Every structure is written in C-alpha cells, then in structure tokens.
Design an enzyme around this catalytic site. Structure first.
Site, PDB file in Angstrom:
ATOM      1  N   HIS A 138       1.166  -0.841   0.206  1.00 13.51           N
ATOM      2  CA  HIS A 138       0.011  -0.268   0.126  1.00 13.51           C
ATOM      3  C   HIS A 138       0.650   1.343  -0.029  1.00 13.51           C
ATOM      4  CE1 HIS A 138      -0.003   1.488   4.549  1.00 13.51           C
ATOM      5  NE2 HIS A 138       0.099  -0.003   4.561  1.00 13.51           N
ATOM      6  N   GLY A 172       3.032   5.882  10.341  1.00 16.14           N
ATOM      7  CA  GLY A 172       4.686   5.678   9.258  1.00 16.14           C
ATOM      8  C   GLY A 172       5.149   4.146   9.931  1.00 16.14           C
ATOM      9  N   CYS A 229       3.901   0.952   9.362  1.00 17.76           N
ATOM     10  CA  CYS A 229       4.293  -0.325   8.812  1.00 17.76           C
ATOM     11  C   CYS A 229       5.046  -0.788   7.945  1.00 17.76           C
ATOM     12  CB  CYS A 229       2.720   0.256   7.213  1.00 17.76           C
ATOM     13  SG  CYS A 229       1.334   0.953   7.608  1.00 17.76           S
TER      14      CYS A 229
HETATM   15  C1  LIG Z   1       1.005   1.943   7.573  1.00 18.40           C
HETATM   16  O1  LIG Z   1       1.716   2.480   8.495  1.00 18.40           O
HETATM   17  C2  LIG Z   1      -0.240   2.238   8.383  1.00 18.40           C
HETATM   18  C3  LIG Z   1      -0.842   2.518   9.826  1.00 18.40           C
HETATM   19  C4  LIG Z   1      -1.844   2.672  11.114  1.00 18.40           C
HETATM   20  C5  LIG Z   1      -1.947   4.046  11.377  1.00 18.40           C
HETATM   21  C6  LIG Z   1      -2.328   3.741  12.606  1.00 18.40           C
HETATM   22  N1  LIG Z   1      -2.168   2.549  13.003  1.00 18.40           N
HETATM   23  C7  LIG Z   1      -1.633   1.653  12.361  1.00 18.40           C
HETATM   24  O2  LIG Z   1      -1.082   0.637  13.248  1.00 18.40           O
HETATM   25  N2  LIG Z   1      -1.191   1.773   8.331  1.00 18.40           N
HETATM   26  C8  LIG Z   1      -2.725   2.106   7.222  1.00 18.40           C
HETATM   27  O3  LIG Z   1      -2.952   3.648   7.586  1.00 18.40           O
HETATM   28  C9  LIG Z   1      -3.622   1.300   6.671  1.00 18.40           C
HETATM   29  C10 LIG Z   1      -4.108   1.882   5.163  1.00 18.40           C
HETATM   30  C11 LIG Z   1      -4.142   0.914   4.243  1.00 18.40           C
HETATM   31  C12 LIG Z   1      -4.790   1.881   2.445  1.00 18.40           C
HETATM   32  C13 LIG Z   1      -4.022  -0.479   4.376  1.00 18.40           C
HETATM   33  N3  LIG Z   1      -5.365   2.122   7.604  1.00 18.40           N
HETATM   34  C14 LIG Z   1      -5.501   1.407   8.937  1.00 18.40           C
HETATM   35  O4  LIG Z   1      -5.002   1.045   9.024  1.00 18.40           O
HETATM   36  C15 LIG Z   1      -7.005   1.362   8.930  1.00 18.40           C
HETATM   37  C16 LIG Z   1      -7.298   1.878   8.417  1.00 18.40           C
HETATM   38  C17 LIG Z   1      -9.168   2.661   9.042  1.00 18.40           C
HETATM   39  C18 LIG Z   1      -9.320   1.895  10.301  1.00 18.40           C
HETATM   40  C19 LIG Z   1     -10.976   2.798  10.834  1.00 18.40           C
HETATM   41  C20 LIG Z   1     -11.529   2.552  10.318  1.00 18.40           C
HETATM   42  C21 LIG Z   1     -11.775   2.492   8.727  1.00 18.40           C
HETATM   43  C22 LIG Z   1     -10.222   2.785   8.725  1.00 18.40           C
END
Ligand SMILES: *C(=O)[C@H](C[C@@H]1CCNC1=O)NC(=O)[C@H](CC(C)C)NC(=O)/C=C/c1ccccc1
Ligand SMILES: *C(=O)[C@H](C[C@@H]1CCNC1=O)NC(=O)[C@H](CC(C)C)NC(=O)/C=C/c1ccccc1
Lengths: 303, 303
Positions: B41, B143, B145
């Site tokens: 992603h 950040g 991931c």
């Molecule tokens: C990567 O760094 C990030 C880590 C997240 C940020 C907050 N805590 C974490 O572990 N991954 C993402 O942001 C990810 C991106 C997608 C395109 C895979 N999305 C999410 O972690 C959350 C999506 C979500 C959560 C709750 C409600 C609606 C959507």
C-alpha cells in the site's frame, strides 16, 4: 493506537556485551572504548561471601586472572581497578562498536530498558522501573550479573543500571555504572530486605492519560479535587504524594486530552476507593505505575 | 527469579530496517540480501484506498518511483515486483548486515517480538501474541507500517509478521513476509472487524506454572479434573479447548514443578469460577494468556 510496555531497541548495547571470567565465576561485562565494566563480586569465592573484603581479593589478583571474551575473540586485560562495586578492566582493544554514551544515575519512579544477558550473550530485553524502595522487579537468573539497564535519547545510550543480586522477595538490586548501589544493599550473600515500597502516583496518572488517549474513558467523572484532598487519599492507599511539579510534568498530557490534572486526580481517588468493579484499563485490572509521562508521550504522540 | 514480558534482542533486525518512499507516502522496509520488502500500500494514493487495484498502480510505477534509504545512504532500486500484499524492491546492494534468516508463518497462540519503526528508524521493541482471531494487540502509529515481528533461535531470525493496519477496535493486522494476511483482512481503508476472540488456554496454564516456579502458589488445590470436565468449563468462559497435545507440551513444566497438568487445570477451573478475590498472580489481577510454554521455559529454566 495501542499501549505496550516498550523497551528501547537493544542493538547498540548488544555490541557492548562481553563475557568476563575470574576463577570459576563467569558473568557479563560492558565493553566501552578500552574498558570493560563488571560486578566486582566476580572475584569472590564461595568461602568469602558473607563479608568479602574486596580490596583484599583484588590486591591478590593479576591481570592474567581475568579472561575477557567478546564473542569468540579473547581480549587481553592490561589493567584493573575497582570503582565502588564495579571492576574496570582495561583491555588492549577499544570496542569498535562503542556507541555515544553517558553514565547516568536515575531516580525512583523512572524507567529503563534491561538487556538480560548470560555468558556475554543477550537473551532478551524488557522495561523496568526503579521502585521507590530502589529495587527493580526484573527477570534475572544465575549468570545474569553484569547485565545493564539503559535509556536512549537520539543515538546516545545513557547507561543507568548494572545487575548484582536478587533479594529474598524475588526483586532485584544493582548499581549505577559508577558502582554505587541503588538503595541500602551490599554485594554479599545475605539475606537483605528492601524498605517498604509505595505506588508511583504521577505514573499512574500518566497511564490514565494514556488510557484516555486510547479511548478508555469509563473511569472519568465531573468531580475535581484539591491537590491537598487528593494527597490525603493517596497517603491512605500507600501512594506517593503528588507535587505541583508532577502536575506541571503532566501538563502536555492534560492539554492533549483536555482533562485537567486535578480532574484525573478525582478519577484516581474514586478508583482507589471503589476499585474497578470488574472493568479493565488498557488491558489491566490493576492500576499501572511503571509508565512515566515521557513513556506515554513517546508512545501515544498523535493519538 | 522474576517473570517479565520479554522481547528478543533487536539488534539483528535493526540492521535490516530501511525507509521506503513512493509519492508522498513513507514507511518502513526490510532489507535482506539485495531485496527490500515493504507493504504494497506504499504505492496507494488518497483517491484509491477503498478498492485499490494493486496490479494497476504497480504497472504504472517505475523503479525510479521508489526511494530507498538505509540510514543516510540511498539505495538504487533495480527491480520491483509484487508478492501478495508485499512489494519486493530489488536493490543494487546486498545488505552487509543480513542475518541468517527464515520466513515463517506463525499460529494463533504463538508469540513474537515486534520492532516498532518510523522512517526506517527503530523506536521500541515489545512482545506480541497472535490472537486466535488473527489480530495482534500492538502499539503502532501512523508511519509504522513495514515494521516486522520475529523470533530468534540460535542466531537465525525467523521473520513472521509485517505490519499493515489498525482495526476500529484498536487492534492490529498484518501479513507474513510472503505478504499473506493473518486473518480475513485486506489492505484497504475500511472499516474491518475481527472475528470473536478467545483466551489461549494452554498459555494461561503455562503462566500458572511460571507463577508456581516463582513462588506464587495460593491458587493451587488438591482437586484434579478430567480433560473433558475442564473443557466443559473452558467453553463456558470463552477459553479454547485444551487438547492432549497441549497437555504433552506442558509436560516439562509439569515435571519441573511436580504439579500434574490436570491438577493445574483444576486450579484454573476454580479461578474461572471464583476469580482471584483481590489477589494477584505474577503481579497481574487477570489471567495472562500471551506467554507460551516455550516462553516460560526460556525465562524460568532453573527456577
Ligand atoms: C501504516 O503505517 C498504517 C499504520 C496505522 C496507522 C494507525 N495505526 C496503524 O497501525 N497503516 C494504515 O494506515 C492502513 C492503510 C491501508 C491502505 C492498509 N489503514 C489503517 O490502518 C486503518 C484503516 C481504518 C481503520 C479504522 C476505520 C476505518 C479505516
Ligand atoms: C549474578 O549473576 C547473580 C544474579 C542472581 C542470581 C539469581 N537471580 C539473580 O539476580 N548475583 C548473585 O548471585 C548475588 C552474589 C552476591 C555475592 C552479590 N547474590 C544474590 O543475588 C542473592 C543473595 C541471597 C538471596 C536470598 C537469600 C540469601 C542470599
């Protein structure tokens, strides 16, 4: 989101751990520049442990009585001296992995990471707090002495703890890296008791702010309390008095959550008087006091 | 003595962490030999997150769209490919710090160490269990991931987890290092729920054996129970069934303490039915299920 007991990455310290043998006793040493630091009781024998006279055992030792091994490379000891309860073994090689470092003594209520080692080899890493009674609740087996505790800021390792002993209660005691014990303990095989411990109040409050930042809000209320009326309750439950300086230290967490410090104090007072009634906070059924305000900010910054 | 949630020393993994940027998105990558592994992603934009077609975004990318930095040294990407939900970026330099390693997928109920990183820089290390519902209860911010989870045996790092996302409940989800998700999660910005979780029974028993090994004995009794009658109680409290294989796995801990597995089961049944009545076990007012039998043996061997 999430809140875990988090240690600093241990790599920089792993590069400093060596094995030190004197007689039939092997423990860990810390190799920084051309000096190896280790517990002085490495020079003790089974027959001189009640009251070892350390300057005596030491005067009777030579450089060639100390075998220092870094991985599978032997280091030649070219000088030895005692600094309080630690030995300083000068070696003929400066450690090429020496990080930028400081020797810092910490305060009760402060946290640090411990790199548990055996035979100069790192085994695991975990987070500890210095208790008000100057013990730490660690995880240490025979052979672990000389393992160190540390914090990292930027790329500088502040060493704060070297491990020496376990008390009958199962808690642990050691020195700063100048060899000065934390607390009223001595490096000899008694039978030593810690003073009565207390709960680190400012840390419990910090952890409640962590809980709110992570969405745990059930313990909040509209009550506020005076600092005086709170400390009256704290003293009854074996909690350390909360000072204005602690309130100031909690400032940023208060600002981030919009909960005044004295408001969180009112939540704490109710928790002390009623318990949780089967609920949990950040996965714990107990009030956690081994996270500093800094630990919380470092882990929860930006939710 | 003592029992702590202990992570593996992180040095070997720290030497593998790099920063990977595509567009305005920066996250962490894992640099092993001449390949950098990261969450796919990283190639997504804000406008294609509900249902990104990843082969499409990828076909539209070049090697020069990926900036890889190891510390402050830029690595030249000479090839890119997708493997399920991870990207493999071939670089023109083999990592000189590459440890001996394996890519292993773990089972629910197994533990691992997480090295949390931001911008390719390690922040902290902590221990996690794979929940029965294939989530982990970690500590991850924007950040993070590309941070990885791992175990060490001898000097070989078995990588088992790469971090991708956080669920609405605040738990975390990710892939093995082949990019295959743990559990029924997908790398897209919904709104995804985990299945109902359960308590890892064999681990709770392992931790009770740790408690006995550390002198906490108050929960023991003379009762024994049948495996059937225990599992009847377990199912009522949302505990996973205990199998004969779990009983065999607990063999060494049973032998070290002289408490039969089915005897400890009888202690667990009483704890489930009566609670602790204000007492604690190894410093917890809850029954802990994120220590495996191996974790206990590793930390408590020889008392
Ligand atoms: C990567 O760094 C990030 C880590 C997240 C940020 C907050 N805590 C974490 O572990 N991954 C993402 O942001 C990810 C991106 C997608 C395109 C895979 N999305 C999410 O972690 C959350 C999506 C979500 C959560 C709750 C409600 C609606 C959507
Ligand atoms: C050093 O490796 C060792 C670490 C101990 C072993 C068990 N858990 C630990 O932390 N330090 C010692 O063995 C130390 C040696 C002295 C000469 C300083 N002695 C003790 O830790 C315990 C002494 C004791 C404890 C309880 C009752 C009576 C004596």
């Amino acid at each position: 989101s999430g809140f875990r007991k988090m240690a600093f990455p241990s790599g920089k310290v792993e590069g400093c751990m060596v094995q030190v043998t004197c007689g039939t006793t092997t423990l860990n040493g810390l190799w920084l520049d051309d000096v190896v630091y280790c517990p002085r009781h490495v020079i003790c024998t089974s027959e001189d442990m009640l009251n070892p006279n350390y300057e005596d055992l030491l005067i009777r030792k030579s450089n060639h009585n100390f075998l220092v091994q870094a991985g599978n490379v032997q280091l030649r000891v070219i000088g030895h001296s005692m600094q309080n309860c630690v030995l300083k073994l000068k070696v003929d090689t400066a450690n090429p992995k020496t990080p930028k470092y400081k020797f810092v003594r910490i305060q009760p209520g402060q946290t640090f990471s411990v790199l548990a080692c055996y035979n100069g080899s790192p085994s695991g890493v975990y987070q500890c707090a210095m208790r008000p009674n100057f013990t730490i609740k660690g995880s240490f087996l025979n052979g672990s002495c000389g393992s160190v505790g540390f914090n990292i800021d930027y790329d500088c390792v502040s060493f704060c703890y070297m491990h020496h002993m376990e008390l009958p209660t199962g808690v642990h005691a050691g020195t700063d890296l100048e060899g000065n014990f934390y607390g009223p303990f001595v490096d000899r095989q008694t039978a030593q008791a810690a003073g009565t411990d207390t709960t680190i109040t400012v840390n419990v409050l910090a952890w409640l702010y962590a809980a709110v930042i992570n969405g745990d809000r059930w313990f909040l209320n509209r009550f506020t309390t005076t600092l005086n009326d709170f400390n009256l309750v704290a003293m009854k439950y074996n909690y350390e008095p909360l000072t204005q300086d602690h309130v100031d230290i909690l400032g940023p967490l208060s600002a981030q959550t919009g909960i005044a410090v004295l408001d969180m104090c009112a939540s704490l007072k109710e928790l002390l008087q009623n318990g949780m009634n089967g609920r949990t906070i950040l996965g714990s059924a107990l009030l956690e006091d081994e996270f500093t305000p800094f630990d919380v900010v470092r882990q929860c910054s930006g939710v």
